[PDB]
Amino acid sequence: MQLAKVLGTVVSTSKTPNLTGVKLLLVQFLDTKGQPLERYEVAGDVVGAGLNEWVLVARGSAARKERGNGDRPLDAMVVGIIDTVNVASGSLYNKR
Amino acid sequence: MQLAKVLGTVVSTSKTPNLTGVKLLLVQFLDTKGQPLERYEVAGDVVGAGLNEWVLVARGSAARKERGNGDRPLDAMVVGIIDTVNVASGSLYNKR
Amino acid sequence: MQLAKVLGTVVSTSKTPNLTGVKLLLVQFLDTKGQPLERYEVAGDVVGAGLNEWVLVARGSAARKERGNGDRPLDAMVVGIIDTVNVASGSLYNKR
Amino acid sequence: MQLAKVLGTVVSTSKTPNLTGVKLLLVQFLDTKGQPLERYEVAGDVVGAGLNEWVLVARGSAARKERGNGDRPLDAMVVGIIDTVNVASGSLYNKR
Amino acid sequence: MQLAKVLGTVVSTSKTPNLTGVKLLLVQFLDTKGQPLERYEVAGDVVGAGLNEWVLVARGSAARKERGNGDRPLDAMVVGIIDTVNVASGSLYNK
Protein backbone atom coordinates (compact mmCIF):
# COMPACT_ATOMS: atom_id res chain seq x y z
CA MET A 1 0.00 0.00 0.00
CA GLN A 2 0.95 3.72 -0.35
CA LEU A 3 1.19 6.49 2.14
CA ALA A 4 -0.96 9.42 0.94
CA LYS A 5 -2.49 12.72 2.06
CA VAL A 6 -6.16 13.62 1.54
CA LEU A 7 -6.40 16.55 -0.81
CA GLY A 8 -10.09 16.73 -1.54
CA THR A 9 -13.29 15.05 -2.73
CA VAL A 10 -14.44 14.12 -6.26
CA VAL A 11 -18.10 14.57 -7.19
CA SER A 12 -19.47 12.63 -10.13
CA THR A 13 -23.16 12.42 -10.87
CA SER A 14 -23.00 10.72 -14.27
CA LYS A 15 -21.37 7.40 -13.36
CA THR A 16 -21.83 3.64 -13.22
CA PRO A 17 -24.46 2.15 -10.90
CA ASN A 18 -21.67 0.14 -9.20
CA LEU A 19 -20.11 3.43 -8.06
CA THR A 20 -23.20 4.71 -6.32
CA GLY A 21 -22.76 5.00 -2.56
CA VAL A 22 -18.97 5.23 -2.84
CA LYS A 23 -17.29 8.34 -1.35
CA LEU A 24 -14.52 9.40 -3.74
CA LEU A 25 -11.47 10.94 -2.27
CA LEU A 26 -8.55 12.47 -4.10
CA VAL A 27 -5.44 11.25 -2.31
CA GLN A 28 -1.95 12.49 -3.28
CA PHE A 29 0.88 10.02 -2.78
CA LEU A 30 3.72 10.57 -0.33
CA ASP A 31 7.28 9.29 -0.46
CA THR A 32 9.39 7.63 2.33
CA LYS A 33 10.36 11.09 3.66
CA GLY A 34 6.70 12.15 3.96
CA GLN A 35 7.07 14.39 0.90
CA PRO A 36 4.36 14.77 -1.82
CA LEU A 37 4.65 12.91 -5.07
CA GLU A 38 2.99 13.59 -8.42
CA ARG A 39 1.32 10.20 -8.41
CA TYR A 40 -2.22 10.23 -6.96
CA GLU A 41 -5.45 8.25 -6.92
CA VAL A 42 -9.09 9.11 -6.81
CA ALA A 43 -9.87 6.44 -4.20
CA GLY A 44 -13.05 5.07 -2.61
CA ASP A 45 -13.10 5.69 1.18
CA VAL A 46 -14.28 2.95 3.51
CA VAL A 47 -12.60 4.38 6.62
CA GLY A 48 -13.83 8.03 6.93
CA ALA A 49 -10.73 10.08 6.16
CA GLY A 50 -10.55 13.85 6.10
CA LEU A 51 -8.67 16.73 4.52
CA ASN A 52 -4.93 16.61 5.15
CA GLU A 53 -5.03 13.33 7.06
CA TRP A 54 -2.34 10.76 6.13
CA VAL A 55 -3.81 7.52 4.88
CA LEU A 56 -3.15 4.01 3.55
CA VAL A 57 -4.04 3.48 -0.11
CA ALA A 58 -4.59 -0.02 -1.45
CA ARG A 59 -4.16 -0.38 -5.26
CA GLY A 60 -5.47 -2.66 -7.96
CA SER A 61 -7.76 -5.58 -7.10
CA ALA A 62 -6.94 -5.14 -3.39
CA ALA A 63 -9.28 -2.11 -3.47
CA ARG A 64 -12.27 -4.46 -4.04
CA LYS A 65 -11.68 -6.68 -1.00
CA GLU A 66 -14.06 -5.06 1.50
CA ARG A 67 -17.55 -6.37 2.43
CA GLY A 68 -19.65 -4.85 -0.40
CA ASN A 69 -17.00 -3.81 -2.93
CA GLY A 70 -16.36 -6.97 -4.97
CA ASP A 71 -18.35 -5.85 -8.02
CA ARG A 72 -17.36 -2.15 -8.02
CA PRO A 73 -14.94 -0.58 -10.50
CA LEU A 74 -12.60 0.30 -7.70
CA ASP A 75 -8.86 0.71 -8.50
CA ALA A 76 -7.77 2.43 -5.31
CA MET A 77 -9.19 2.30 -1.80
CA VAL A 78 -8.42 4.21 1.43
CA VAL A 79 -8.06 1.23 3.80
CA GLY A 80 -6.79 3.15 6.86
CA ILE A 81 -5.74 6.35 8.60
CA ILE A 82 -2.13 6.58 9.72
CA ASP A 83 -1.39 7.47 13.38
CA THR A 84 2.42 7.05 13.18
CA VAL A 85 5.24 6.22 10.80
CA ASN A 86 8.33 5.08 12.77
CA VAL A 87 11.79 4.90 11.10
CA ALA A 88 15.38 4.35 12.39
CA SER A 89 15.88 8.11 12.99
CA GLY A 90 12.63 8.04 14.98
CA SER A 91 9.05 9.08 14.15
CA LEU A 92 8.63 10.39 10.60
CA TYR A 93 4.99 11.10 11.31
CA ASN A 94 2.77 11.36 14.37
CA LYS A 95 -0.84 12.51 13.82
CA ARG A 96 -0.84 14.11 17.29
CA MET B 1 -9.11 5.93 -10.46
CA GLN B 2 -7.50 8.66 -12.47
CA LEU B 3 -8.65 12.08 -13.46
CA ALA B 4 -8.42 12.30 -17.26
CA LYS B 5 -9.60 14.43 -20.21
CA VAL B 6 -11.20 13.04 -23.38
CA LEU B 7 -8.85 13.67 -26.33
CA GLY B 8 -10.66 11.77 -29.06
CA THR B 9 -11.72 8.34 -30.33
CA VAL B 10 -9.92 5.26 -31.61
CA VAL B 11 -11.37 3.22 -34.42
CA SER B 12 -10.30 -0.35 -34.86
CA THR B 13 -11.87 -2.64 -37.41
CA SER B 14 -9.54 -5.59 -37.17
CA LYS B 15 -10.07 -6.64 -33.57
CA THR B 16 -11.03 -9.33 -31.11
CA PRO B 17 -14.70 -10.35 -31.06
CA ASN B 18 -14.94 -9.40 -27.37
CA LEU B 19 -14.07 -5.84 -28.27
CA THR B 20 -17.05 -5.50 -30.63
CA GLY B 21 -19.62 -2.93 -29.52
CA VAL B 22 -17.13 -1.16 -27.24
CA LYS B 23 -16.69 2.58 -27.81
CA LEU B 24 -12.95 3.27 -27.50
CA LEU B 25 -11.86 6.68 -26.17
CA LEU B 26 -8.35 8.14 -25.96
CA VAL B 27 -8.29 9.72 -22.47
CA GLN B 28 -5.16 11.76 -21.40
CA PHE B 29 -4.29 11.64 -17.71
CA LEU B 30 -4.51 14.65 -15.43
CA ASP B 31 -2.49 15.42 -12.33
CA THR B 32 -3.63 16.75 -8.94
CA LYS B 33 -3.53 20.37 -10.20
CA GLY B 34 -5.65 19.48 -13.29
CA GLN B 35 -2.66 19.49 -15.61
CA PRO B 36 -2.10 17.07 -18.48
CA LEU B 37 0.20 14.15 -17.95
CA GLU B 38 2.00 12.03 -20.54
CA ARG B 39 0.24 8.89 -19.28
CA TYR B 40 -2.92 7.99 -21.20
CA GLU B 41 -5.29 5.08 -21.79
CA VAL B 42 -7.36 3.95 -24.65
CA ALA B 43 -10.39 3.24 -22.52
CA GLY B 44 -13.77 1.71 -23.14
CA ASP B 45 -16.65 4.15 -22.42
CA VAL B 46 -19.68 2.95 -20.43
CA VAL B 47 -20.93 6.42 -19.48
CA GLY B 48 -21.05 8.49 -22.71
CA ALA B 49 -18.20 11.02 -22.41
CA GLY B 50 -17.23 13.51 -25.05
CA LEU B 51 -14.33 15.64 -26.21
CA ASN B 52 -12.63 17.74 -23.53
CA GLU B 53 -14.86 16.46 -20.75
CA TRP B 54 -13.05 15.50 -17.47
CA VAL B 55 -13.67 11.83 -16.56
CA LEU B 56 -12.79 9.07 -14.07
CA VAL B 57 -10.80 6.13 -15.44
CA ALA B 58 -10.74 2.69 -13.73
CA ARG B 59 -7.65 0.57 -14.44
CA GLY B 60 -6.70 -3.00 -14.68
CA SER B 61 -9.39 -5.56 -13.79
CA ALA B 62 -11.65 -2.88 -12.29
CA ALA B 63 -12.30 -2.00 -15.96
CA ARG B 64 -14.14 -5.29 -16.38
CA LYS B 65 -16.66 -4.93 -13.55
CA GLU B 66 -19.63 -3.51 -15.51
CA ARG B 67 -22.71 -5.60 -16.51
CA GLY B 68 -21.42 -7.14 -19.78
CA ASN B 69 -17.67 -6.47 -19.58
CA GLY B 70 -16.35 -9.48 -17.68
CA ASP B 71 -14.87 -11.37 -20.62
CA ARG B 72 -13.71 -8.39 -22.65
CA PRO B 73 -10.02 -7.53 -22.95
CA LEU B 74 -10.41 -4.23 -21.12
CA ASP B 75 -7.61 -2.52 -19.28
CA ALA B 76 -9.18 0.79 -18.76
CA MET B 77 -12.76 1.97 -18.43
CA VAL B 78 -14.34 5.48 -18.34
CA VAL B 79 -16.58 4.98 -15.28
CA GLY B 80 -17.78 8.50 -14.70
CA ILE B 81 -17.93 12.13 -15.80
CA ILE B 82 -16.52 14.64 -13.31
CA ASP B 83 -18.74 17.59 -12.28
CA THR B 84 -16.46 18.93 -9.57
CA VAL B 85 -13.02 18.43 -7.97
CA ASN B 86 -12.83 20.29 -4.59
CA VAL B 87 -9.56 20.89 -2.72
CA ALA B 88 -8.55 22.94 0.38
CA SER B 89 -7.98 26.09 -1.71
CA GLY B 90 -11.49 25.57 -3.15
CA SER B 91 -12.84 24.16 -6.40
CA LEU B 92 -10.10 22.82 -8.74
CA TYR B 93 -12.64 22.04 -11.47
CA ASN B 94 -16.27 22.77 -12.05
CA LYS B 95 -17.80 21.61 -15.32
CA ARG B 96 -20.12 24.69 -15.36
CA MET C 1 -5.06 -0.05 -23.70
CA GLN C 2 -2.02 1.58 -25.15
CA LEU C 3 -1.20 2.82 -28.65
CA ALA C 4 1.83 0.87 -29.90
CA LYS C 5 3.84 0.29 -33.07
CA VAL C 6 5.04 -3.15 -34.13
CA LEU C 7 8.80 -3.27 -34.03
CA GLY C 8 9.45 -6.96 -34.70
CA THR C 9 9.04 -10.60 -33.57
CA VAL C 10 10.45 -12.49 -30.58
CA VAL C 11 11.41 -16.10 -31.05
CA SER C 12 11.74 -18.30 -28.00
CA THR C 13 12.09 -22.09 -28.27
CA SER C 14 12.90 -22.86 -24.63
CA LYS C 15 9.66 -21.77 -22.97
CA THR C 16 6.63 -22.67 -20.87
CA PRO C 17 4.09 -25.15 -22.50
CA ASN C 18 1.33 -22.53 -22.08
CA LEU C 19 3.22 -20.24 -24.42
CA THR C 20 3.28 -22.77 -27.27
CA GLY C 21 1.38 -21.52 -30.30
CA VAL C 22 1.49 -17.86 -29.22
CA LYS C 23 2.90 -15.40 -31.70
CA LEU C 24 5.15 -12.98 -29.81
CA LEU C 25 5.48 -9.40 -30.96
CA LEU C 26 7.73 -6.65 -29.77
CA VAL C 27 5.44 -3.58 -29.65
CA GLN C 28 6.96 -0.18 -28.71
CA PHE C 29 4.54 2.18 -26.92
CA LEU C 30 3.37 5.44 -28.45
CA ASP C 31 2.39 8.65 -26.68
CA THR C 32 -0.65 10.88 -27.20
CA LYS C 33 1.09 12.70 -30.13
CA GLY C 34 1.95 9.45 -31.92
CA GLN C 35 5.54 9.58 -30.68
CA PRO C 36 7.61 6.56 -29.62
CA LEU C 37 8.12 5.96 -25.92
CA GLU C 38 10.81 3.88 -24.18
CA ARG C 39 8.06 1.67 -22.65
CA TYR C 40 7.33 -1.49 -24.66
CA GLU C 41 5.88 -4.95 -24.32
CA VAL C 42 6.54 -8.31 -25.80
CA ALA C 43 2.89 -9.10 -26.47
CA GLY C 44 1.03 -12.09 -27.76
CA ASP C 45 -0.82 -11.38 -31.01
CA VAL C 46 -4.37 -12.60 -31.54
CA VAL C 47 -5.20 -10.20 -34.42
CA GLY C 48 -2.42 -10.71 -37.00
CA ALA C 49 -0.44 -7.45 -36.79
CA GLY C 50 2.69 -6.67 -38.82
CA LEU C 51 5.75 -4.44 -38.95
CA ASN C 52 5.11 -0.73 -38.44
CA GLU C 53 1.36 -1.15 -37.94
CA TRP C 54 -0.22 0.80 -35.07
CA VAL C 55 -1.93 -1.37 -32.54
CA LEU C 56 -3.99 -1.60 -29.36
CA VAL C 57 -2.20 -3.28 -26.45
CA ALA C 58 -4.15 -4.77 -23.46
CA ARG C 59 -2.04 -5.10 -20.24
CA GLY C 60 -2.25 -7.23 -17.17
CA SER C 61 -4.95 -9.82 -16.72
CA ALA C 62 -6.86 -8.20 -19.65
CA ALA C 63 -4.34 -9.93 -21.88
CA ARG C 64 -5.72 -13.34 -20.96
CA LYS C 65 -9.40 -12.67 -21.78
CA GLU C 66 -9.54 -14.28 -25.23
CA ARG C 67 -10.99 -17.68 -26.08
CA GLY C 68 -8.01 -19.94 -25.29
CA ASN C 69 -5.70 -17.60 -23.38
CA GLY C 70 -6.96 -17.89 -19.81
CA ASP C 71 -4.14 -20.12 -18.55
CA ARG C 72 -1.33 -18.58 -20.48
CA PRO C 73 1.22 -16.42 -18.75
CA LEU C 74 0.42 -13.37 -20.88
CA ASP C 75 1.00 -9.84 -19.62
CA ALA C 76 0.33 -8.01 -22.83
CA MET C 77 -1.98 -8.83 -25.76
CA VAL C 78 -2.25 -7.07 -29.16
CA VAL C 79 -6.06 -6.84 -29.29
CA GLY C 80 -6.55 -4.70 -32.36
CA ILE C 81 -5.06 -2.86 -35.30
CA ILE C 82 -5.65 0.88 -35.41
CA ASP C 83 -7.36 2.47 -38.46
CA THR C 84 -7.60 6.01 -37.13
CA VAL C 85 -6.93 8.08 -34.06
CA ASN C 86 -8.97 11.32 -34.09
CA VAL C 87 -8.22 14.35 -31.86
CA ALA C 88 -9.61 17.96 -31.65
CA SER C 89 -7.05 19.23 -34.19
CA GLY C 90 -8.19 16.41 -36.48
CA SER C 91 -6.75 13.04 -37.45
CA LEU C 92 -3.60 12.11 -35.50
CA TYR C 93 -3.25 8.89 -37.50
CA ASN C 94 -4.95 7.29 -40.51
CA LYS C 95 -3.56 3.98 -41.69
CA ARG C 96 -4.33 5.05 -45.32
CA MET D 1 9.31 -9.41 -6.51
CA GLN D 2 11.43 -6.47 -5.46
CA LEU D 3 14.54 -6.14 -3.39
CA ALA D 4 13.74 -3.85 -0.46
CA LYS D 5 15.09 -2.72 2.91
CA VAL D 6 12.96 -2.38 6.02
CA LEU D 7 12.73 1.29 7.02
CA GLY D 8 10.26 0.97 9.87
CA THR D 9 6.61 0.31 10.89
CA VAL D 10 3.20 1.86 10.16
CA VAL D 11 0.60 2.10 12.90
CA SER D 12 -3.03 2.60 11.88
CA THR D 13 -5.86 2.29 14.34
CA SER D 14 -8.65 3.66 12.17
CA LYS D 15 -8.75 0.91 9.50
CA THR D 16 -10.70 -1.73 7.67
CA PRO D 17 -11.58 -4.96 9.64
CA ASN D 18 -9.71 -6.95 6.96
CA LEU D 19 -6.48 -5.22 7.94
CA THR D 20 -6.76 -6.24 11.57
CA GLY D 21 -4.00 -8.58 12.62
CA VAL D 22 -1.66 -7.59 9.77
CA LYS D 23 1.79 -6.17 10.66
CA LEU D 24 2.45 -3.13 8.41
CA LEU D 25 6.03 -2.44 7.36
CA LEU D 26 7.39 0.49 5.43
CA VAL D 27 9.88 -1.06 2.97
CA GLN D 28 12.08 1.14 0.66
CA PHE D 29 12.88 -0.40 -2.78
CA LEU D 30 16.44 -1.22 -3.76
CA ASP D 31 17.93 -1.35 -7.24
CA THR D 32 20.07 -4.03 -8.90
CA LYS D 33 23.23 -2.58 -7.29
CA GLY D 34 21.73 -2.68 -3.77
CA GLN D 35 20.96 1.07 -3.83
CA PRO D 36 17.81 2.64 -2.35
CA LEU D 37 15.14 3.84 -4.78
CA GLU D 38 12.31 6.37 -4.20
CA ARG D 39 9.73 3.64 -4.73
CA TYR D 40 8.45 2.03 -1.57
CA GLU D 41 5.55 -0.02 -0.24
CA VAL D 42 3.76 -0.19 3.08
CA ALA D 43 3.45 -4.01 3.02
CA GLY D 44 1.97 -6.66 5.25
CA ASP D 45 4.60 -8.88 6.79
CA VAL D 46 4.08 -12.61 6.97
CA VAL D 47 7.70 -13.60 7.59
CA GLY D 48 8.91 -11.50 10.54
CA ALA D 49 11.31 -8.91 9.12
CA GLY D 50 13.17 -6.32 11.16
CA LEU D 51 14.74 -2.88 10.69
CA ASN D 52 17.42 -2.83 7.96
CA GLU D 53 16.97 -6.39 6.85
CA TRP D 54 16.79 -6.93 3.05
CA VAL D 55 13.54 -8.46 1.94
CA LEU D 56 11.48 -9.82 -0.96
CA VAL D 57 8.30 -7.83 -1.72
CA ALA D 58 5.44 -9.37 -3.67
CA ARG D 59 3.14 -6.79 -5.44
CA GLY D 60 -0.40 -6.73 -6.69
CA SER D 61 -2.66 -9.70 -6.18
CA ALA D 62 0.37 -11.89 -5.32
CA ALA D 63 0.33 -10.19 -1.93
CA ARG D 64 -2.96 -11.98 -1.18
CA LYS D 65 -1.81 -15.52 -1.80
CA GLU D 66 -0.94 -16.47 1.83
CA ARG D 67 -3.09 -18.86 3.91
CA GLY D 68 -5.42 -16.20 5.41
CA ASN D 69 -4.89 -13.15 3.26
CA GLY D 70 -7.23 -13.74 0.35
CA ASP D 71 -9.90 -11.26 1.45
CA ARG D 72 -7.53 -8.57 2.73
CA PRO D 73 -6.82 -5.29 0.94
CA LEU D 74 -3.10 -5.99 0.45
CA ASP D 75 -1.26 -4.63 -2.46
CA ALA D 76 2.28 -5.51 -1.19
CA MET D 77 3.44 -8.38 1.00
CA VAL D 78 6.91 -9.14 2.46
CA VAL D 79 7.20 -12.82 1.44
CA GLY D 80 10.85 -13.39 2.40
CA ILE D 81 14.14 -12.31 4.01
CA ILE D 82 17.17 -12.22 1.76
CA ASP D 83 20.32 -14.13 2.80
CA THR D 84 22.30 -13.43 -0.33
CA VAL D 85 22.17 -11.87 -3.77
CA ASN D 86 24.75 -13.30 -6.15
CA VAL D 87 25.78 -11.61 -9.40
CA ALA D 88 28.55 -12.22 -12.01
CA SER D 89 31.00 -10.00 -10.10
CA GLY D 90 30.26 -12.09 -7.02
CA SER D 91 28.09 -11.52 -3.97
CA LEU D 92 26.12 -8.26 -4.09
CA TYR D 93 24.75 -8.84 -0.59
CA ASN D 94 25.37 -11.34 2.19
CA LYS D 95 23.38 -10.91 5.42
CA ARG D 96 26.35 -12.29 7.44
CA MET E 1 6.34 -9.68 -21.18
CA GLN E 2 9.68 -7.87 -20.84
CA LEU E 3 13.03 -8.59 -22.40
CA ALA E 4 15.48 -9.17 -19.51
CA LYS E 5 18.98 -10.51 -18.86
CA VAL E 6 19.78 -12.86 -15.99
CA LEU E 7 22.02 -11.15 -13.43
CA GLY E 8 22.15 -13.76 -10.69
CA THR E 9 20.18 -15.68 -8.06
CA VAL E 10 18.44 -14.73 -4.81
CA VAL E 11 18.71 -17.02 -1.82
CA SER E 12 16.14 -16.63 0.89
CA THR E 13 15.67 -19.20 3.66
CA SER E 14 13.23 -17.31 5.91
CA LYS E 15 10.24 -17.18 3.58
CA THR E 16 6.58 -18.06 3.05
CA PRO E 17 5.78 -21.79 2.60
CA ASN E 18 4.31 -21.09 -0.84
CA LEU E 19 7.69 -19.88 -2.03
CA THR E 20 9.37 -23.16 -1.18
CA GLY E 21 10.70 -24.95 -4.27
CA VAL E 22 10.77 -21.76 -6.32
CA LYS E 23 14.11 -20.86 -7.97
CA LEU E 24 14.51 -17.08 -7.61
CA LEU E 25 16.32 -15.21 -10.32
CA LEU E 26 17.36 -11.58 -10.37
CA VAL E 27 16.56 -10.48 -13.94
CA GLN E 28 17.45 -6.97 -15.14
CA PHE E 29 15.10 -5.45 -17.74
CA LEU E 30 16.33 -4.52 -21.22
CA ASP E 31 14.93 -1.86 -23.57
CA THR E 32 13.93 -2.12 -27.27
CA LYS E 33 17.61 -1.58 -28.31
CA GLY E 34 18.83 -4.48 -26.10
CA GLN E 35 20.19 -2.01 -23.55
CA PRO E 36 19.96 -2.52 -19.73
CA LEU E 37 17.35 -0.61 -17.75
CA GLU E 38 17.22 0.11 -14.03
CA ARG E 39 13.92 -1.74 -13.69
CA TYR E 40 14.37 -5.35 -12.66
CA GLU E 41 12.49 -8.22 -11.04
CA VAL E 42 13.29 -11.06 -8.66
CA ALA E 43 11.45 -13.66 -10.70
CA GLY E 44 10.60 -17.30 -10.25
CA ASP E 45 12.16 -19.54 -12.94
CA VAL E 46 10.06 -22.26 -14.53
CA VAL E 47 12.19 -22.62 -17.68
CA GLY E 48 15.79 -23.09 -16.44
CA ALA E 49 17.59 -19.87 -17.38
CA GLY E 50 21.28 -19.10 -16.76
CA LEU E 51 23.66 -16.20 -16.16
CA ASN E 52 23.59 -13.54 -18.96
CA GLU E 53 20.89 -15.40 -20.95
CA TRP E 54 18.11 -13.22 -22.44
CA VAL E 55 14.68 -14.01 -21.07
CA LEU E 56 10.98 -13.19 -21.26
CA VAL E 57 9.49 -12.00 -17.98
CA ALA E 58 5.71 -12.21 -17.29
CA ARG E 59 4.49 -9.65 -14.68
CA GLY E 60 1.63 -9.55 -12.22
CA SER E 61 -1.00 -12.31 -12.10
CA ALA E 62 0.40 -13.69 -15.36
CA ALA E 63 3.34 -14.98 -13.28
CA ARG E 64 1.00 -17.43 -11.46
CA LYS E 65 -0.43 -19.16 -14.54
CA GLU E 66 1.77 -22.27 -14.68
CA ARG E 67 0.85 -25.77 -13.47
CA GLY E 68 1.66 -25.42 -9.73
CA ASN E 69 2.00 -21.65 -9.23
CA GLY E 70 -1.62 -20.58 -8.65
CA ASP E 71 -1.28 -20.11 -4.91
CA ARG E 72 2.23 -18.67 -4.80
CA PRO E 73 3.01 -15.08 -4.05
CA LEU E 74 4.62 -14.58 -7.49
CA ASP E 75 4.81 -11.21 -9.23
CA ALA E 76 7.29 -12.05 -11.93
CA MET E 77 7.98 -15.36 -13.67
CA VAL E 78 10.64 -16.17 -16.29
CA VAL E 79 8.49 -17.87 -18.94
CA GLY E 80 10.95 -18.24 -21.78
CA ILE E 81 14.54 -18.02 -23.04
CA ILE E 82 14.98 -15.75 -26.05
CA ASP E 83 16.63 -17.19 -29.18
CA THR E 84 16.27 -14.15 -31.35
CA VAL E 85 14.72 -10.65 -31.47
CA ASN E 86 14.13 -9.47 -35.05
CA VAL E 87 13.57 -5.80 -35.95
CA ALA E 88 13.31 -3.87 -39.29
CA SER E 89 17.07 -3.22 -39.33
CA GLY E 90 17.58 -6.95 -38.85
CA SER E 91 18.41 -9.16 -35.91
CA LEU E 92 18.70 -7.20 -32.62
CA TYR E 93 19.74 -10.36 -30.78
CA ASN E 94 20.74 -13.86 -31.73
CA LYS E 95 21.65 -16.30 -28.92
From Swiss-Prot, chains A, B, C, D:
The record ties this protein, via Gene3D superfamilies, to:
EutN/Ccml
Q: Which CDD domains is this protein grouped with?
A: EutN_CcmL
Domain BMV stretches: 1-83
Which GO cellular component term is one of those annotated? carboxysome
Query: Which domain of life does this protein belong to?
Result: Bacteria
Molecular-function GO terms, alphabetical = structural constituent of carboxysome shell
Keyword annotations of the record = Bacterial microcompartment, Carbon dioxide fixation, Carboxysome, Photosynthesis
The protein's predominant localisation is other
Subcellular localization is given as: Carboxysome
Q: Is Nuclease among the key words of this record?
A: no
Mind telling me which InterPro entries this protein's record contains? CcmL, EutN_CcmL, EutN_CcmL_sf
The domain-related comment in the record is: The tight homopentamer forms a pore with an opening of about 5 Angstroms in diameter which opens into a wider tunnel at the base of the truncated pyramid. The pore is positively charged.
Assigned protein family: Belongs to the CcmL/EutN family. CcmL subfamily.
Q: Tell me, in a sentence or two, what this protein's role is.
A: Probably forms vertices in the carboxysome, a polyhedral inclusion where RuBisCO (ribulose bisphosphate carboxylase, rbcL-rbcS) is sequestered. Has been modeled to induce curvature upon insertion into an otherwise flat hexagonal molecular layer of CcmK subunits.
Q: What is this protein called?
A: Carboxysome shell vertex protein CcmL
Classification of source organism: Bacteria, Bacillati, Cyanobacteriota, Cyanophyceae, Synechococcales
Curated annotation (Swiss-Prot), chain E:
Recorded GO CC terms: carboxysome
Instruction: Please state where this protein is localized.
Output: Carboxysome
Q: Which Pfam families match?
A: EutN_CcmL
- The primary site where this protein sits is other
Q: Which Gene3D superfamilies match?
A: EutN/Ccml (2.40.50.220)
Q: Which UniProt key words apply to this protein?
A: Bacterial microcompartment, Carbon dioxide fixation, Carboxysome, Photosynthesis
Q: Where is the BMV domain?
A: 1-83
Which InterPro entries does the record match to this protein?
CcmL (IPR046387), EutN_CcmL (IPR004992), EutN_CcmL_sf (IPR036677)
List the Gene Ontology MF annotations in alphabetical order: structural constituent of carboxysome shell
Membrane-spanning segments: none
One GO biological process this protein is involved in is:
carbon fixation
User: Domain of life, per the record?
Assistant: Bacteria
What PANTHER family does the database record attribute to this sequence? BACTERIAL MICROCOMPARTMENT SHELL VERTEX PROTEIN EUTN (PTHR36539:SF1), ETHANOLAMINE UTILIZATION PROTEIN EUTN (PTHR36539)
* Role noted for this protein: Probably forms vertices in the carboxysome, a polyhedral inclusion where RuBisCO (ribulose bisphosphate carboxylase, rbcL-rbcS) is sequestered. Has been modeled to induce curvature upon insertion into an otherwise flat hexagonal molecular layer of CcmK subunits.
Domain note: The tight homopentamer forms a pore with an opening of about 5 Angstroms in diameter which opens into a wider tunnel at the base of the truncated pyramid. The pore is positively charged.
* Binding partners and assembly: Homopentamer. Interacts with full-length CcmM.
**Which family is this protein grouped under?**
Belongs to the CcmL/EutN family. CcmL subfamily.
Q: What is this protein called?
A: Carboxysome shell vertex protein CcmL
Which species? Synechocystis sp. (strain ATCC 27184 / PCC 6803 / Kazusa)
